């Protein structure tokens, strides 16, 4: 394939959904895991595939990978350090990590990877009244060689990469989760996609 | 309208340019007024300039702009509050503002306006070998409202707006100004200068 020629003036459409992503990230943390917190995303930058290593954090990472099997295809990386991985694994199990995370701390940060990364494509999803199946999410937890090697198989190497940079600041409580994600979707497909809003949002002018 | 096009994967080099605006804002700031800083680009998005009032919060707040009479045209806003306003002032006369604002804090800060903007604008302009002739930003404490109705006279309702959280980290130091950049070039001037980029 598809033309990966866009009109610069629909770029807004990107920071549109971003910020419908970032929404609906908020409404399912309360409706499934009865936390209420304000949730800012900003895109960061946009990069190469391969430039992602550099933007992840220099100790261990936590990531989640989700492949979008309809437009814009791709995929989605949710990544954050041990600080926040230690936040959310507290808040969601009622337990301290001070003597390592057990098992149900892990099975927390992967529920809690599955929440946020939902609540983001959902409110994608809403906007352009249009589903996007995501697959089964694939955990990483290594340094950030090891988690791009993994996460940038089977992707193409010339896509746009959207660098996001996600506050989740809990209400009422000194709480907040510092994430990082990336929107790596296939190049074309993700053109067709604006251009899809651009249309319905022009559409209403004849309302 | 004809359309103005920009190939979705050279949206990497908007990121790399704003970079070379940072780079030349630390540059500038170490040579012309004796500050070593670190700048960094904390978030970069695009919004229609219909919408940029509230991207700039509210009560009165300063700003700092400049429009542009040459390639890529168009208008340059930085906007900051109150307390960084002081904040630069102090940092450049060494006297806190506690016994007033004064014209000397002033002429600092407009001196500062002048490092940051031209910093930035220069260090895009450098990489896109275009040479930019403009004035002195023009510098004014408002409301929101007030500063986005007088940037936005003579501006297109359908330019992309590049809005930019830049941070001003002083070295050895814990002081930092915060500011918010606006950048609506003319559209058409914009795509044709990224069409013809590579590093
Ligand atoms: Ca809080
Ligand atoms: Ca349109
Ligand atoms: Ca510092």
Do not use: W
């Not at 970032?22 to 943390?29: G, H, P, R, T, Y």
């Not at 352009?128 to 697959?135: E, K, P, R, V, Y």
């Amino acid at each position: 394939g598809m033309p990966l020629l866009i009109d610069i003036r629909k770029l807004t459409l990107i920071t549109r959904l971003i910020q419908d992503g970032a929404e609906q990230v908020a409404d399912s943390l309360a409706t499934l895991a009865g936390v209420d917190a304000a949730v800012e995303i900003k895109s960061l930058s946009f990069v190469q595939p391969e430039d992602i290593a550099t933007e992840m954090g220099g100790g261990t990472i936590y990531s989640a990978r989700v492949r979008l099997t309809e437009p814009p295809y791709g995929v989605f990386l949710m990544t954050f350090e041990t600080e926040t991985a230690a936040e959310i694994a507290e808040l969601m199990t009622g337990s301290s990590v001070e003597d390592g995370f057990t098992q149900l701390h892990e099975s927390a940060l992967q529920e809690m990877c599955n929440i946020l990364t939902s609540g983001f494509i959902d409110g994608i999803a809403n906007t352009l009244n249009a589903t996007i199946n995501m697959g089964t999410p694939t955990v990483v937890q290594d340094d950030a060689t090891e988690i791009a090697d993994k996460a940038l198989s089977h992707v193409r190497r010339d896509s746009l990469t959207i660098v996001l940079d996600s506050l989740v600041d809990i209400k009422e409580s000194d709480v907040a989760f510092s994430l990082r994600i990336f929107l790596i979707p296939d190049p074309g497909s993700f053109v067709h996609l604006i251009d899809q809003l651009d249309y319905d949002t022009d559409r209403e002018t004849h309302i």
